[PDB]
Short mmCIF file of C-alpha atoms and ligand atoms in Angstrom, two decimals:
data_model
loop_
_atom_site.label_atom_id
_atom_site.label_comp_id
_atom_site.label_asym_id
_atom_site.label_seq_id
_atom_site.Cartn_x
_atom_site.Cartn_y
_atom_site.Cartn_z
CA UNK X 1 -135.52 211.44 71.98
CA UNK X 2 -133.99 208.52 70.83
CA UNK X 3 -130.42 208.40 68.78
CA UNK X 4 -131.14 207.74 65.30
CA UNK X 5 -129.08 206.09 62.18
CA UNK X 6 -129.32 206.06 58.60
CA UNK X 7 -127.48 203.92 56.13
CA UNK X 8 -127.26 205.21 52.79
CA UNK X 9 -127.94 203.23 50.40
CA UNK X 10 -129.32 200.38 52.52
CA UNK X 11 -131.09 198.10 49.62
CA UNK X 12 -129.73 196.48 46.74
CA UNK X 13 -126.20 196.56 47.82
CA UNK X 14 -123.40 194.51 45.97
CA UNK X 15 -120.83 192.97 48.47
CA UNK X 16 -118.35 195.88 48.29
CA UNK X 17 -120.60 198.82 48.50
CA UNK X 18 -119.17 201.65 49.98
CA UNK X 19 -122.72 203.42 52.46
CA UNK X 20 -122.68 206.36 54.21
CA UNK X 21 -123.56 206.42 57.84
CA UNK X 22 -125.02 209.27 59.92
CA UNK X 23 -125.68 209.30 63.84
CA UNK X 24 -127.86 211.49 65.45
CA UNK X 25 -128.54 211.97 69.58
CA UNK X 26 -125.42 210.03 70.20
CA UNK X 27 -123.48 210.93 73.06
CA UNK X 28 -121.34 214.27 72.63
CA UNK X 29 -117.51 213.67 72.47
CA UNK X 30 -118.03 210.03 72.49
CA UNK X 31 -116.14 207.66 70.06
CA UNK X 32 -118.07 205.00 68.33
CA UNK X 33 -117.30 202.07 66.30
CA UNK X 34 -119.40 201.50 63.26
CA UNK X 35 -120.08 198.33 61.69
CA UNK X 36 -122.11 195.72 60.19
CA UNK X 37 -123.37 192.95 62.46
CA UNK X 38 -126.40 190.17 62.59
CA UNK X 39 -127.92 188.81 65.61
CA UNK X 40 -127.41 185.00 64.74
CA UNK X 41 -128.60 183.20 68.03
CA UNK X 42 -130.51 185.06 71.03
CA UNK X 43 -128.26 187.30 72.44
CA UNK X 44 -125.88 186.73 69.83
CA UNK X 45 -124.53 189.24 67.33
CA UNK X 46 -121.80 188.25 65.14
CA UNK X 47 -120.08 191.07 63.09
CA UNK X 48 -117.90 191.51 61.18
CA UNK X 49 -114.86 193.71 62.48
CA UNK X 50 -112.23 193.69 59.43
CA UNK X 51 -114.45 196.65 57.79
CA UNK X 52 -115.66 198.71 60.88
CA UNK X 53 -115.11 202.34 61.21
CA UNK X 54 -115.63 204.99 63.86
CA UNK X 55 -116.42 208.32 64.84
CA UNK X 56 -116.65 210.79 67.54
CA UNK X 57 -120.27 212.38 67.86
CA UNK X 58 -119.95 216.07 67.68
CA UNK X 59 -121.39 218.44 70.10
CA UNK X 60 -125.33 218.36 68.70
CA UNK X 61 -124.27 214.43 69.19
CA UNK X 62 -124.05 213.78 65.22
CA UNK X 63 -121.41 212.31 62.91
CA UNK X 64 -120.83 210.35 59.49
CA UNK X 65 -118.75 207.77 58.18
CA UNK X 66 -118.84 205.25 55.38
CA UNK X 67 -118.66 201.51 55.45
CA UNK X 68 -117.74 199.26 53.31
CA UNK X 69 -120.89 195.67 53.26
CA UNK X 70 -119.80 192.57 52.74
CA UNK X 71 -122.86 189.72 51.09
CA UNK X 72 -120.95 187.40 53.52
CA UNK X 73 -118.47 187.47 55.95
CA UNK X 74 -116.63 185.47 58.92
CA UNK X 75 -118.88 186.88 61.80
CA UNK X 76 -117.06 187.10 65.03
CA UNK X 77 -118.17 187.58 68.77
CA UNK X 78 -117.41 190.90 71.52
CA UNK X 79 -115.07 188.34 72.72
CA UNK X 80 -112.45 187.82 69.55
CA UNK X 81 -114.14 184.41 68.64
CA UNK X 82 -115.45 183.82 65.51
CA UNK X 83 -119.29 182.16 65.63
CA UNK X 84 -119.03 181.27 61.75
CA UNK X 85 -119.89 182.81 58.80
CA UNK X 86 -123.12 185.03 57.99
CA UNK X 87 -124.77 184.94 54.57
CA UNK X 88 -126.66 188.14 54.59
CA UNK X 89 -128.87 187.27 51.99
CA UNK X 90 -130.44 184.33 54.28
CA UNK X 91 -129.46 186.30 57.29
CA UNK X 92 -130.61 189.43 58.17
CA UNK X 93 -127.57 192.33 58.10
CA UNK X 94 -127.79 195.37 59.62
CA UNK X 95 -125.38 198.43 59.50
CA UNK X 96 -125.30 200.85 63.41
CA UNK X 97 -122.98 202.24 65.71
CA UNK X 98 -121.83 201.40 68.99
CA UNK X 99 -120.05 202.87 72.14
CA UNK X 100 -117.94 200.82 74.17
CA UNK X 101 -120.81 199.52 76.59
CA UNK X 102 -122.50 198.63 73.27
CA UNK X 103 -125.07 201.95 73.25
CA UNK X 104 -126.49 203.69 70.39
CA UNK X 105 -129.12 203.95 67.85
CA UNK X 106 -131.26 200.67 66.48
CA UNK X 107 -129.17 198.80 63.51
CA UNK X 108 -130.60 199.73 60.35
CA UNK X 109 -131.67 196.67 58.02
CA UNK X 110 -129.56 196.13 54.89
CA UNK X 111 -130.16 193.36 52.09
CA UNK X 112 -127.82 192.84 49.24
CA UNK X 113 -128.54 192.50 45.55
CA UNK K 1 -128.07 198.06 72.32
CA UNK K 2 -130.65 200.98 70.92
CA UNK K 3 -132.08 202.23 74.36
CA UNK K 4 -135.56 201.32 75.53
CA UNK K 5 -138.42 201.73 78.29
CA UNK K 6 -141.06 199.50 79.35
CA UNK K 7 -144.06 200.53 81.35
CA UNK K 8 -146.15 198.18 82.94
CA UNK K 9 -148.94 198.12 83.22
CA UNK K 10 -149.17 200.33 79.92
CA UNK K 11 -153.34 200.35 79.30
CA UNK K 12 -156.38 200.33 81.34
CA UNK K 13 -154.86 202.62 83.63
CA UNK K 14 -156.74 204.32 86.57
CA UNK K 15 -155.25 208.25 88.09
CA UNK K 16 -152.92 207.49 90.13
CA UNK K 17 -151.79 203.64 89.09
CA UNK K 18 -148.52 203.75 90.12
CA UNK K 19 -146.49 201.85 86.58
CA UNK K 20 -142.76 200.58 86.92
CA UNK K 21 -140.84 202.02 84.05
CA UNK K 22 -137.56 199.56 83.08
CA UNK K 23 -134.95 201.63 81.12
CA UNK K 24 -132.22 199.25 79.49
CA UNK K 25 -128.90 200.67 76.79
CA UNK K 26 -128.97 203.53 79.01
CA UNK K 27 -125.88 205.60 79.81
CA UNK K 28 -123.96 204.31 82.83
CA UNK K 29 -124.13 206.73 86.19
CA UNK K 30 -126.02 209.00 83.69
CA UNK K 31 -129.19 210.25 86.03
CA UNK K 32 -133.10 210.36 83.82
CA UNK K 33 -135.94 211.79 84.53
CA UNK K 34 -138.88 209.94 84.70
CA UNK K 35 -142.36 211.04 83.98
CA UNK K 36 -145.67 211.70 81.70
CA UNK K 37 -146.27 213.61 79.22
CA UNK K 38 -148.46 214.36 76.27
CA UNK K 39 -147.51 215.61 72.89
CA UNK K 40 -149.62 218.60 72.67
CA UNK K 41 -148.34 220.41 69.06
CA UNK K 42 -146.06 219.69 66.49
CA UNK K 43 -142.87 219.41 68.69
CA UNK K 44 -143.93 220.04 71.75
CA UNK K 45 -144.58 218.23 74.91
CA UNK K 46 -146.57 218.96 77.66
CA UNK K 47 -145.47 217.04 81.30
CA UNK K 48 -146.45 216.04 84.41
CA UNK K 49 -143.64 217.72 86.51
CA UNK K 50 -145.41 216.92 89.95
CA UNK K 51 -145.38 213.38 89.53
CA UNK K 52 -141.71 213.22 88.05
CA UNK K 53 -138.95 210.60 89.58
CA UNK K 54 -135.36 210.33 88.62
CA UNK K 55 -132.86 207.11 88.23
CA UNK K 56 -129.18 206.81 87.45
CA UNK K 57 -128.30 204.04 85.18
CA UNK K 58 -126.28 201.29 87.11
CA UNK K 59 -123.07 200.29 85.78
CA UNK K 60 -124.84 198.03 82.46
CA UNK K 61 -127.23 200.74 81.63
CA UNK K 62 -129.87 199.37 82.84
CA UNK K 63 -132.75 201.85 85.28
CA UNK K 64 -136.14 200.79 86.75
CA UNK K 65 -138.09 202.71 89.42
CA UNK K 66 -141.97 202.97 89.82
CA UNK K 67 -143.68 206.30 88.32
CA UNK K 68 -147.32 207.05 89.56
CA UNK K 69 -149.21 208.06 86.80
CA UNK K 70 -152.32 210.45 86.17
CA UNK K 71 -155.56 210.52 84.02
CA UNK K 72 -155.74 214.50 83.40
CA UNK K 73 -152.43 216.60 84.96
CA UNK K 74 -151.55 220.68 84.36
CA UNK K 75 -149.53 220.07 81.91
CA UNK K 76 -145.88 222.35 81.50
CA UNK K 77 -143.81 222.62 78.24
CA UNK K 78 -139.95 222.56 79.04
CA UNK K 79 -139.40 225.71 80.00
CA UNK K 80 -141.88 225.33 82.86
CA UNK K 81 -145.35 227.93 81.30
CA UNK K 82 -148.60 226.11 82.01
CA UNK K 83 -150.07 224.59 78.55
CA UNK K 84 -153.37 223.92 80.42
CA UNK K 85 -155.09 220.90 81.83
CA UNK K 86 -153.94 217.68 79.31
CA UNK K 87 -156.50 214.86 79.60
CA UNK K 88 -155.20 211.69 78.31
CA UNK K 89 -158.46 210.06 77.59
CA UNK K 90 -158.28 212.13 74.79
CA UNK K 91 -154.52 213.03 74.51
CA UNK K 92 -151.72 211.01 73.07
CA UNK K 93 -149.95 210.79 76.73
CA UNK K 94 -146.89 208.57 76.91
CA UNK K 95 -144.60 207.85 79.78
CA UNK K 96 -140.49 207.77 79.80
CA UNK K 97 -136.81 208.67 80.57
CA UNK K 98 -134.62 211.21 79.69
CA UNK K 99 -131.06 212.76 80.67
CA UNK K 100 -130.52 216.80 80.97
CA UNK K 101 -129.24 216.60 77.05
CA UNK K 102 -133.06 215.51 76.08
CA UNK K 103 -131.51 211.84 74.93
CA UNK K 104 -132.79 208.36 75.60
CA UNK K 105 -135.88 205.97 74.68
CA UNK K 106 -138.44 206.65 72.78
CA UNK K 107 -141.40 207.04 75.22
CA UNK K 108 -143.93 203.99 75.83
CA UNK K 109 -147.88 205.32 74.97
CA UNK K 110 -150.61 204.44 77.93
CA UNK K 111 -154.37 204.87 78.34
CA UNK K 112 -156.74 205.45 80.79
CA UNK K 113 -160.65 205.08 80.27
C1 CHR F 201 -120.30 195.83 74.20
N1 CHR F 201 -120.61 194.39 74.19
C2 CHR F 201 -121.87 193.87 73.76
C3 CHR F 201 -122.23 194.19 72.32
O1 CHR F 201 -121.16 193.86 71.44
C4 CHR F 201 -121.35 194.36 70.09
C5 CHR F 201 -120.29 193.70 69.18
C6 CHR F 201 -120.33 192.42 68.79
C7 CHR F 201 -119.45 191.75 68.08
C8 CHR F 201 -118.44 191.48 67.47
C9 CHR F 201 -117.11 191.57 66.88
O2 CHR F 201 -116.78 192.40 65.78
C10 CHR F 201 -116.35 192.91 67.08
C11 CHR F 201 -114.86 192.91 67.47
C12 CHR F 201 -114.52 192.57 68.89
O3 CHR F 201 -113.83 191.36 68.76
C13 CHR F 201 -113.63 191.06 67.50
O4 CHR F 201 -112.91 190.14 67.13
O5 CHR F 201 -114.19 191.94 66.70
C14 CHR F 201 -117.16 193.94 67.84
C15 CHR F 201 -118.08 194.53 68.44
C16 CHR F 201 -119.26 194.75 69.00
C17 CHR F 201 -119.61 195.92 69.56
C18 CHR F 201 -121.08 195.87 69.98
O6 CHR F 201 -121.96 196.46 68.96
C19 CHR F 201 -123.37 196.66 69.30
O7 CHR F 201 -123.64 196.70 70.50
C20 CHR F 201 -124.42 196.86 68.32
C21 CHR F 201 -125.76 196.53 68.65
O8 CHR F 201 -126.19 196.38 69.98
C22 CHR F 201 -126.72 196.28 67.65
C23 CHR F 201 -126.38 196.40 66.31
C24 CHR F 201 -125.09 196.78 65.96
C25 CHR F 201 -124.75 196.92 64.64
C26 CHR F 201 -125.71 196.65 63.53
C27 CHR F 201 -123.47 197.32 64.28
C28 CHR F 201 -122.51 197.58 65.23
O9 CHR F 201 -121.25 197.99 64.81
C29 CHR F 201 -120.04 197.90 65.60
C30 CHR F 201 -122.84 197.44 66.54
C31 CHR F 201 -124.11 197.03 66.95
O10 CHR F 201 -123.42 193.46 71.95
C32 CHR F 201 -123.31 192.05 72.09
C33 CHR F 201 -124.67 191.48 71.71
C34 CHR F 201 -122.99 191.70 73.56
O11 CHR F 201 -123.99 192.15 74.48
C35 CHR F 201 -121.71 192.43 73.94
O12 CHR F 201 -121.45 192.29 75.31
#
């Protein structure tokens, strides 16, 4: 059974929307960062880390958060570098979670007013 | 890195083709079972115990091992009482990975014929 998320809302956002996040059949007692990210190049996901939150999955593996989207933002690389910025409206955004070997449920798609 | 499974080969399947199942965003020294199974009521899912393997995830997450597969099996729900012969000509039977908490990849639909 695979870990699920859902980003609520997820269409229509203005940049500054505040969305709730839920995780399901994450790991139990694990910490996760949640965030909002694009793949820009194969292999590449650029995110953006100045708005990121986190939680630890409870014992049934669940949890919530909310995030704050940006439209746009500097997107920057696992490694600290910064790949260069992401338009989300010509890009395509998505909000997830992630443990720290980069596991967890499928990004959810998110498009911006 | 949602987590997923490959089977291949996934369709015109014989009993007893032996498929190698590739499990990738899996948990790290985590062990999975392996195996077929059928969904056989809302809910519930009837396996293939006797043909069952098992893999740990390697330090990236990552899990392949071969899985021999079968065209009608006695099929067990998870507590281990007989649901009755499951033939997947006609059955929805799927093949994947799991840990003992239930979690992991969605499981990867095959046919026989
Ligand atoms: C653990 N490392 C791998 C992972 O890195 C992801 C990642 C990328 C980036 C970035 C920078 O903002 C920072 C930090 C680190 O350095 C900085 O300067 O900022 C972070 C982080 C990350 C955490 C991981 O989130 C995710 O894994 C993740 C996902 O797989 C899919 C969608 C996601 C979505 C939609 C959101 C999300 O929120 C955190 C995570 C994911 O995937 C990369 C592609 C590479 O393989 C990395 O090696």
């Amino acid at each position: 059974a695979a870990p699920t998320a859902t980003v609520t809302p997820s269409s229509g956002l203005s940049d500054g929307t505040v969305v709730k996040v839920a995780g399901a059949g994450l790991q139990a007692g694990t910490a996760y960062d949640v965030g909002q990210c694009a793949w820009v190049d194969t292999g590449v996901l650029a995110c953006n880390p100045a708005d990121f939150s986190s939680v630890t999955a409870d014992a049934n593996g669940s949890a919530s958060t909310s995030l704050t989207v940006r439209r746009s933002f500097e997107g920057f690389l696992f490694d600290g570098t910064r790949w260069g910025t992401v338009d989300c409206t010509t890009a395509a955004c998505q909000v997830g979670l992630s443990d720290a070997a980069g596991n967890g449920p499928e990004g959810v798609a998110i498009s911006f007013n």
